[PDB]
Amino acid sequence: ETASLEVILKKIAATIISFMQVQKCTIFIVDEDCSDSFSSVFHMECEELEKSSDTREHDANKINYMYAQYVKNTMEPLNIPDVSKDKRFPIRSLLCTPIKNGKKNKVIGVCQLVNKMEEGKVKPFNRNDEQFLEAFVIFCGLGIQNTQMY
Amino acid sequence: ETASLEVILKKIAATIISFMQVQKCTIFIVDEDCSDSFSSVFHMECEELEKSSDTREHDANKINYMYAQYVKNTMEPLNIPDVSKDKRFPIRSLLCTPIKNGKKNKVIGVCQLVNKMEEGKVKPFNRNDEQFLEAFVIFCGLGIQNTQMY
Amino acid sequence: EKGAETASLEVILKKIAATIISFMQVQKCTIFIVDEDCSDSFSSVFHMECEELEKSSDTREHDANKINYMYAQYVKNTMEPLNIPDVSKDKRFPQCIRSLLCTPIKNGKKNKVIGVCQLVNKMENTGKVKPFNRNDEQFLEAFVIFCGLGIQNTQM
Amino acid sequence: EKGAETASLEVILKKIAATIISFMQVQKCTIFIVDEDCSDSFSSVFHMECEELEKSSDTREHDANKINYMYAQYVKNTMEPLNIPDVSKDKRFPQCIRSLLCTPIKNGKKNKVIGVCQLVNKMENTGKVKPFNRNDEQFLEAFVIFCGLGIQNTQM
């Protein structure tokens, strides 16, 4: 049914982004019931958000970069089951994990993930997702380092 | 150099989104010069934006859905070289193309693309991109229709 | 429940191989899962590959005459798609069955073949291989139109 | 300028085949570009494929003993990676060269092999095949750790 429709939409966006070299794609599907509206609105984006002049410094100050510094700033996963209801900071569930380096020198990046979903609804990130993300950034860290030293 | 670094970042985000079933991913790379800031911030997302109750009707009214209705509402590509400087509507370059149906029955969707880029900078969408997008949505339209009738 | 964990795994294996290929720049990836039931064997061997088969500059005239390029040849000269249900059972071209759908890629003006798209073994959710149907044929006919444009922009 | 349009094309061809595979659910895609220089031949044949090779339930014990599963076997029993520069030139395992990097996938606790990752033909920008180096080996060693977790979550 619509699960199949929601899968094509993903494919179409990823494909168009690949072939055209655009940052954003949105697929609007005319709602069959209300022709004025959209039954599905599938969105995707890819972007390098900083090509500036530390102007990048001041961008870190911003409220959506919060959790990133919090994790760079702890060396430890941050896990927020429902963000609307959360009381440590002034879009729903969020996992965010330090990308560390080769021989645990220090921290070289952060993975934020937003809205784990159900294979369904939006969901919290569990200890098992954490463990998976932790194993994932190991190779990432090692890939990121190669693209400079070489 | 950083072009290679900007490519890994894309791969990492697409991969993490694939494996974890999240909507948003952001890869922060600690700026080597200012440890407080981010040298790169690579962002990606995938989302179904409407699972509601036409509540979807009122969502069409919104200012970022503008151009979508404009194209549903014309049957013709819309092409805006620099949006900040544009005078037809109250993020920069934008192409937006109707997804039509099998035997040109009517319109079943819209592709918005934002920010063509250079293989470099952000760029306008040309007549050639249009022609390419026009040929692209033909198979899309035919794929979208299959996931309902079947 | 136990066929539900196996379709799962295939998905992961494909993701794995696609991910590693993309990151590593290799032509071929094969992931073997050791059979839990006895450790001397593999319960899954998931293969994926990616490569350009014509790295030679003529010497291609000879290669084009290979047995495995016949469908391609047939579609190119004929200028129309070819649909075979079971490549073995077929009589004009000299168990587990194989299905084939081969479609021409044309120039905008549709009077000349500029390439060909050959697809093998349409699949069902972990289902068997099946024949390509008319929607399949319809769909690919629409798909190669934008392929032609892509390709042509590239040969500038 | 004219080798610049050819690396371009390979990129498009890979994108095409990946796109069509993904949309169509087929195991194999081959895109042929008709040689502009003479229409009887193909100047590019870009192949990509995707499939599970063990669809049988024992009968796998026999399959695991195939010649093309030896590296896999060797890595699994040995429990450590295997790196071959030119699979032909190599003497323990019974031109255009082939390079091979095969790494074990382990359980969290690292005392048992649960699968194996075999990579073939590391490539250079349209460059030739080359040997896998130590970074290659380092990188894959880090990559399979998360593979193990993925796989295991799947076998619940």
Short mmCIF file of N, CA, C and O in Angstrom, two decimals, chain C residues 95-141:
data_model
loop_
_atom_site.label_atom_id
_atom_site.label_comp_id
_atom_site.label_asym_id
_atom_site.label_seq_id
_atom_site.Cartn_x
_atom_site.Cartn_y
_atom_site.Cartn_z
N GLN C 95 15.57 -27.42 -12.44
CA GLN C 95 16.55 -26.36 -12.64
C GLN C 95 16.25 -25.08 -11.84
O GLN C 95 15.22 -24.98 -11.18
N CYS C 96 17.18 -24.13 -11.89
CA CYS C 96 16.90 -22.73 -11.55
C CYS C 96 16.85 -21.88 -12.84
O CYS C 96 17.88 -21.69 -13.50
N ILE C 97 15.66 -21.37 -13.20
CA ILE C 97 15.46 -20.52 -14.40
C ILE C 97 16.11 -19.11 -14.31
O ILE C 97 16.45 -18.65 -13.22
N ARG C 98 16.30 -18.46 -15.47
CA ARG C 98 16.79 -17.08 -15.63
C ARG C 98 15.81 -16.29 -16.52
O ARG C 98 15.44 -16.75 -17.57
N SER C 99 15.40 -15.10 -16.09
CA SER C 99 14.58 -14.18 -16.89
C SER C 99 15.39 -12.97 -17.41
O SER C 99 16.34 -12.52 -16.77
N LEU C 100 15.02 -12.45 -18.58
CA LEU C 100 15.81 -11.39 -19.23
C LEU C 100 14.93 -10.33 -19.85
O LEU C 100 13.95 -10.64 -20.54
N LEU C 101 15.28 -9.07 -19.59
CA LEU C 101 14.64 -7.93 -20.22
C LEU C 101 15.69 -6.96 -20.70
O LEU C 101 16.38 -6.32 -19.93
N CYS C 102 15.76 -6.83 -22.00
CA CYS C 102 16.77 -6.01 -22.62
C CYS C 102 16.08 -4.89 -23.44
O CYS C 102 15.26 -5.18 -24.31
N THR C 103 16.38 -3.62 -23.14
CA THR C 103 15.74 -2.47 -23.80
C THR C 103 16.71 -1.50 -24.44
O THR C 103 17.78 -1.24 -23.87
N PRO C 104 16.37 -0.98 -25.64
CA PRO C 104 17.30 -0.04 -26.28
C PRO C 104 17.26 1.36 -25.66
O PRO C 104 16.20 1.82 -25.25
N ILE C 105 18.43 1.98 -25.57
CA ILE C 105 18.57 3.38 -25.22
C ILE C 105 18.74 4.19 -26.50
O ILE C 105 19.69 3.98 -27.26
N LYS C 106 17.84 5.12 -26.74
CA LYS C 106 17.83 5.86 -27.97
C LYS C 106 18.23 7.32 -27.80
O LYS C 106 18.30 7.85 -26.69
N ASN C 107 18.57 7.94 -28.93
CA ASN C 107 18.77 9.38 -28.98
C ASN C 107 17.42 10.08 -28.87
O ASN C 107 16.38 9.50 -29.23
N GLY C 108 17.43 11.32 -28.38
CA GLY C 108 16.21 12.11 -28.23
C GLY C 108 15.26 11.83 -29.37
O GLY C 108 14.09 11.47 -29.15
N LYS C 109 15.77 11.94 -30.60
CA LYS C 109 14.93 11.86 -31.77
C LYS C 109 14.45 10.44 -32.09
O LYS C 109 13.71 10.23 -33.05
N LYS C 110 14.89 9.47 -31.29
CA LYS C 110 14.45 8.06 -31.42
C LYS C 110 14.70 7.32 -32.76
O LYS C 110 14.04 6.31 -33.05
N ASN C 111 15.64 7.81 -33.55
CA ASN C 111 15.99 7.13 -34.81
C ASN C 111 17.34 6.40 -34.74
O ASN C 111 17.79 5.81 -35.73
N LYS C 112 17.97 6.43 -33.56
CA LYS C 112 19.24 5.75 -33.40
C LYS C 112 19.52 5.24 -32.01
O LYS C 112 19.40 5.97 -31.03
N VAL C 113 19.89 3.97 -31.94
CA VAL C 113 20.33 3.33 -30.72
C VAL C 113 21.72 3.82 -30.25
O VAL C 113 22.69 3.72 -30.97
N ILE C 114 21.79 4.36 -29.04
CA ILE C 114 23.09 4.81 -28.51
C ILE C 114 23.60 3.91 -27.37
O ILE C 114 24.75 4.03 -26.94
N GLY C 115 22.73 3.02 -26.90
CA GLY C 115 23.14 1.99 -25.97
C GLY C 115 22.01 1.05 -25.66
O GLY C 115 20.96 1.08 -26.32
N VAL C 116 22.21 0.21 -24.65
CA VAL C 116 21.26 -0.85 -24.36
C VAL C 116 21.29 -1.15 -22.88
O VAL C 116 22.34 -1.14 -22.24
N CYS C 117 20.13 -1.44 -22.34
CA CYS C 117 20.03 -1.77 -20.94
C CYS C 117 19.54 -3.22 -20.79
O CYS C 117 18.40 -3.55 -21.20
N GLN C 118 20.40 -4.09 -20.25
CA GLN C 118 20.08 -5.51 -20.07
C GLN C 118 19.89 -5.78 -18.61
O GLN C 118 20.77 -5.46 -17.81
N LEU C 119 18.76 -6.36 -18.25
CA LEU C 119 18.41 -6.66 -16.88
C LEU C 119 18.19 -8.15 -16.81
O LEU C 119 17.57 -8.73 -17.71
N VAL C 120 18.67 -8.77 -15.73
CA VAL C 120 18.62 -10.22 -15.58
C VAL C 120 18.01 -10.59 -14.24
O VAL C 120 18.31 -9.95 -13.22
N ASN C 121 17.12 -11.57 -14.25
CA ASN C 121 16.57 -12.14 -13.01
C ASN C 121 15.76 -11.20 -12.12
O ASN C 121 16.16 -10.89 -11.00
N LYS C 122 14.64 -10.75 -12.66
CA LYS C 122 13.59 -10.06 -11.94
C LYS C 122 13.25 -10.93 -10.76
O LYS C 122 13.14 -12.12 -10.90
N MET C 123 13.12 -10.33 -9.59
CA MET C 123 12.77 -11.09 -8.39
C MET C 123 11.46 -10.64 -7.78
O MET C 123 10.99 -9.52 -8.04
N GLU C 124 10.86 -11.54 -7.00
CA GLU C 124 9.59 -11.27 -6.32
C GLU C 124 9.87 -10.52 -5.04
O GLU C 124 10.87 -10.80 -4.36
N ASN C 125 9.89 -9.64 -2.06
CA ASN C 125 10.25 -10.27 -0.79
C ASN C 125 10.84 -11.68 -0.97
O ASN C 125 10.10 -12.69 -1.03
N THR C 126 12.18 -11.74 -1.07
CA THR C 126 12.96 -13.00 -1.11
C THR C 126 12.42 -14.08 -2.05
O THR C 126 12.91 -15.21 -2.07
N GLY C 127 11.42 -13.71 -2.84
CA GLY C 127 10.78 -14.62 -3.77
C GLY C 127 11.75 -15.06 -4.85
O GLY C 127 12.86 -14.53 -4.98
N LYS C 128 11.31 -16.04 -5.62
CA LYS C 128 12.13 -16.58 -6.69
C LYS C 128 12.39 -15.55 -7.78
O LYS C 128 12.03 -14.38 -7.65
N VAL C 129 13.06 -15.99 -8.83
CA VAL C 129 13.14 -15.19 -10.02
C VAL C 129 11.80 -15.36 -10.75
O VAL C 129 11.13 -16.38 -10.62
N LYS C 130 11.39 -14.33 -11.46
CA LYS C 130 10.17 -14.42 -12.21
C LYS C 130 10.36 -13.75 -13.54
O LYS C 130 11.34 -13.04 -13.73
N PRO C 131 9.43 -13.99 -14.47
CA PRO C 131 9.46 -13.29 -15.75
C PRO C 131 9.29 -11.79 -15.55
O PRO C 131 8.76 -11.37 -14.53
N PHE C 132 9.78 -11.01 -16.50
CA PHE C 132 9.47 -9.58 -16.57
C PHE C 132 8.11 -9.43 -17.21
O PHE C 132 7.84 -10.10 -18.19
N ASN C 133 7.24 -8.60 -16.64
CA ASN C 133 5.91 -8.37 -17.24
C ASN C 133 5.83 -7.07 -18.04
O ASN C 133 6.85 -6.39 -18.27
N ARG C 134 4.62 -6.71 -18.45
CA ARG C 134 4.42 -5.54 -19.32
C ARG C 134 4.69 -4.25 -18.57
O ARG C 134 5.29 -3.34 -19.15
N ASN C 135 4.29 -4.16 -17.30
CA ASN C 135 4.66 -3.00 -16.48
C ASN C 135 6.16 -2.88 -16.44
O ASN C 135 6.69 -1.81 -16.71
N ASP C 136 6.85 -3.99 -16.15
CA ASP C 136 8.30 -4.02 -16.24
C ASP C 136 8.75 -3.39 -17.56
O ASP C 136 9.57 -2.46 -17.57
N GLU C 137 8.20 -3.88 -18.66
CA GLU C 137 8.57 -3.37 -19.98
C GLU C 137 8.21 -1.89 -20.13
O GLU C 137 9.03 -1.10 -20.60
N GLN C 138 7.00 -1.52 -19.72
CA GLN C 138 6.57 -0.12 -19.73
C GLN C 138 7.57 0.72 -18.97
O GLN C 138 8.04 1.73 -19.45
N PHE C 139 7.91 0.28 -17.76
CA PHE C 139 8.67 1.08 -16.83
C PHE C 139 10.06 1.38 -17.34
O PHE C 139 10.55 2.49 -17.19
N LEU C 140 10.68 0.37 -17.94
CA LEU C 140 12.06 0.47 -18.41
C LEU C 140 12.09 1.34 -19.66
O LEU C 140 13.08 2.04 -19.92
N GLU C 141 11.01 1.27 -20.42
CA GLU C 141 10.88 2.09 -21.63
C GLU C 141 10.85 3.55 -21.25
O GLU C 141 11.35 4.37 -21.98
#
